[PDB]
Amino acid sequence: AMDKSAKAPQITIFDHRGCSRAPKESTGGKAGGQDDEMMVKVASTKVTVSESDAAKKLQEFITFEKGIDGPFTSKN
Amino acid sequence: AMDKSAKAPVITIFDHRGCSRAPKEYTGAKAGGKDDEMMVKAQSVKIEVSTGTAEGVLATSLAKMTK
Amino acid sequence: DAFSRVVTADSKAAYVGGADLQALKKFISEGNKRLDSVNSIVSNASCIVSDAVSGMICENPSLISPSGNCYTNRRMAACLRDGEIILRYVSYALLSGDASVLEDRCLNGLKETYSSLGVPANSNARAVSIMKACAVAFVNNTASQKKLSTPQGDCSGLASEVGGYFDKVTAAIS
Amino acid sequence: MLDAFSRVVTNADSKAAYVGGADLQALKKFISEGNKRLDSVNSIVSNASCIVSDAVSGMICENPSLISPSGNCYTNRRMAACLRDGEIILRYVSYALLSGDASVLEDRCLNGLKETYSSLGVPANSNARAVSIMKACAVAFVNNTASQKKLSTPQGDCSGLASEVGGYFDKVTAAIS
């Protein structure tokens, strides 16, 4: 059941082939190839949005503009 | 001078032609037309960015970079 | 196993790289394409959620009127948060190739909670449907912001799969 | 100068100022290209969060060392300050576009800014790329050549206003590079 904690999976996909920052976080050894420079990270973290951030979003939303993508569907 | 206050002019462009919520904030003279349903607001605001936003941009950047 | 522990038991993050990542890609279909598909959504999540909530509101501005469910910073924050939660569970369903966690941890009981709170189902359905459209375009790399160097090929199967996860959300809350 | 906004631009107070009705009718004939100009401002500021985040994250994907432990966006504190500065700059550019005049941008944002960045070690090459990406975003929002269905405005040619806003970003670039 949905447990009301506001926790959700948090994914980071690191395709860091060729990256000069050495990997140090894996725990299962080496593939002997480019998988050794890539990683999927999964955490379970609480999702939170501050009231101040929500105020910034409202000031954007209230004008009924849009991004490049999508049809314009507003009537206002 | 750049005064180090982190303030900037926040502009809100309210073109609310046809909107059922009545104008009230602007109390100057009326145009007698669609300009009475539209407004430019400006305000000096301290610009703030949260920890959460910063963490989100960090995660985006890590996921989009390669080398 | 490592992701299951995290998303349900083990508090610390799972770091799957190297040989563990090689193994992961043998247990999910189309592993390399699937990780590209997940990244195309997760790395663009901020714009997806913002565009979906903005579009829900621009189609129904009463949501931010004094009687609307997004009125006040507190409520707008909770709505933005919920869009991100939903998108996160859909993205994890695509990563894992399965809906089980999405169903158990995000959807089961959700409609009952929204009914009690008065969170409007038609509006919520629209936020979800805008997020769906965003995700399909990102998987197929046809959004306005494109990933430059993905190897070309057809990801329409993965795009159908993610669409089905969104449809589970819609069915559960509408 | 937009007199209604004089206290806003000097940071004299935090009071909102409003230009509607007859004052707005007159404003649009004081500035040029009035309706299109206000639509252009709206399309930029209403997308500010995304413009700034995409610019900063693009600066970073082009130069990942910015978020290495030695880079100037390392830690939430530094990242937030960088995103904040991107927004401050974008907002002063938006005021130059609203007013049709670069004065407030030059005088209240750019004057003294390079010397602050130099003292802090804020990398100018990286900052110039953040500004370049923000510029490209604004140009695309203003001169948006998609079909009517996809535009929030009546279709027409806003290439002149896009060139104008580009010039304001170029003043930022020249000041800080």
Ligand SMILES: *C(=C)C1=C(C)C(=O)N/C1=C\c1[nH]c(/C=C2\N=C(C[C@H]3NC(=O)C(C=C)=C3C)C(C)=C2CCC(=O)O)c(CCC(=O)O)c1C
């Ligand atoms: C129509 C769009 C709307 C529907 C439908 C609805 O339910 N709400 C609608 C609009 C709406 N407006 C506000 C708030 C403000 N609008 C203005 C601008 C207008 N005031 C004027 O005097 C003129 C012209 C002369 C306007 C145009 C302003 C300044 C505000 C206050 C908020 C701000 O950001 O400064 C809201 C928000 C809730 C409310 O106050 O009613 C909504 C949703």
Ligand SMILES: *C(=C)C1=C(C)C(=O)N/C1=C\c1[nH]c(/C=C2\N=C(C[C@H]3NC(=O)C(C=C)=C3C)C(C)=C2CCC(=O)O)c(CCC(=O)O)c1C
């Ligand atoms: C190359 C891109 C980079 C350049 C150039 C640079 O200056 N920094 C670069 C990358 C970079 N990586 C991190 C942090 C992390 N990277 C991973 C993933 C890798 N670790 C592994 O073990 C493997 C594969 C086996 C990887 C691929 C992880 C887990 C982190 C830690 C952070 C996290 O989100 O968990 C950074 C951040 C600063 C740092 O830690 O060096 C940077 C900028």
Ligand SMILES: *C(=C)C1=C(C)[C@@H](Cc2[nH]c(/C=C3N=C(/C=C4\NC(=O)[C@H](C)[C@H]4[C@@H](*)C)C(C)=C\3CCC(=O)O)c(CCC(=O)O)c2C)NC1=O
């Ligand atoms: C890292 C791999 C990396 C990036 C991150 C990305 C950064 C980048 N972005 C652009 C250009 C644009 N970004 C835009 C932003 C938005 N469009 C929207 O609809 C939303 C609301 C908003 C936030 C995402 C826009 C409008 C543009 C301009 C059009 C375009 O697509 O180019 C660039 C190009 C900059 C330039 O032209 O110099 C870059 C670099 N790219 C990466 O490589």
Ligand SMILES: *C(=C)C1=C(C)[C@@H](Cc2[nH]c(/C=C3N=C(/C=C4\NC(=O)[C@H](C)[C@H]4[C@@H](*)C)C(C)=C\3CCC(=O)O)c(CCC(=O)O)c2C)NC1=O
């Ligand atoms: C209010 C005036 C209003 C909106 C806001 C807007 C909402 C809307 N958006 C879409 C579709 C998409 N939005 C996308 C989002 C993004 N693309 C990017 O490149 C950036 C990073 C990100 C944030 C802006 C995308 C990818 C899509 C899909 C595009 C496509 O299919 O190619 C829609 C359409 C929803 C639907 O199809 O049901 C809408 C309505 N429109 C408004 O009027």
Ligand SMILES: *[C@@H](C)[C@H]1/C(=C/C2=NC(=C\c3[nH]c(C[C@H]4NC(=O)C(C=C)=C4C)c(C)c3CCC(=O)O)/C(CCC(=O)O)=C2C)NC(=O)[C@@H]1C
């Ligand atoms: C739909 C999603 C896309 C598309 C995807 C393709 N990706 C292909 C190959 C590919 N992708 C990666 C990166 C991926 N693997 C990982 O382990 C990680 C991160 C941990 C990621 C992000 C790799 C390694 C590969 C293999 C090739 C290579 O060495 O780069 C691919 C080719 C076919 C295939 O391998 O199955 C496709 C089609 N392509 C598209 O055009 C749409 C938009």
Ligand SMILES: *[C@@H](C)[C@H]1/C(=C/C2=NC(=C\c3[nH]c(C[C@H]4NC(=O)C(C=C)=C4C)c(C)c3CCC(=O)O)/C(CCC(=O)O)=C2C)NC(=O)[C@@H]1C
């Ligand atoms: C580039 C900017 C755009 C574009 C813009 C056009 N806008 C046009 C007309 C227009 N816009 C407004 C709204 C504006 N006036 C205000 O007072 C305020 C807010 C206070 C705003 C936001 C109005 C009232 C009008 C005129 C009436 C109308 O036609 O609705 C317009 C057409 C007229 C013209 O060409 O001058 C255009 C072209 N169009 C584009 O395609 C890009 C993306």
Ligand SMILES: *[C@H](C)[C@H]1/C(=C/C2=NC(=C\c3[nH]c(C[C@H]4NC(=O)C(C=C)=C4C)c(C)c3CCC(=O)O)/C(CCC(=O)O)=C2C)NC(=O)[C@@H]1C
């Ligand atoms: C945004 C698109 C919506 C909208 C959403 C609102 N949700 C509110 C509260 C709320 N949401 C949840 C579900 C959330 N918590 C979880 O743990 C998970 C999954 C694991 C999810 C998806 C809960 C449990 C709650 C109540 C407790 C809380 O606030 O954290 C909410 C606040 C309502 C109120 O306080 O009055 C809103 C506004 N509202 C909309 O109008 C659109 C459709």
Ligand SMILES: *[C@H](C)[C@H]1/C(=C/C2=NC(=C\c3[nH]c(C[C@H]4NC(=O)C(C=C)=C4C)c(C)c3CCC(=O)O)/C(CCC(=O)O)=C2C)NC(=O)[C@@H]1C
């Ligand atoms: C982002 C694209 C940059 C980046 C920016 C950083 N700026 C930092 C500090 C800082 N910035 C300013 C200028 C700002 N304040 C104002 O009042 C105005 C205009 C009116 C502007 C544009 C100041 C004065 C300061 C110092 C004081 C302060 O931060 O409040 C900064 C350091 C922050 C910290 O360590 O706390 C950063 C990281 N960094 C980058 O790498 C890119 C290029």
Ligand SMILES: [Cl-]
């Ligand atoms: Cl774009």
Ligand SMILES: [Mg+2]
């Ligand atoms: Mg409009």
Ligand SMILES: [Mg+2]
């Ligand atoms: Mg001067």
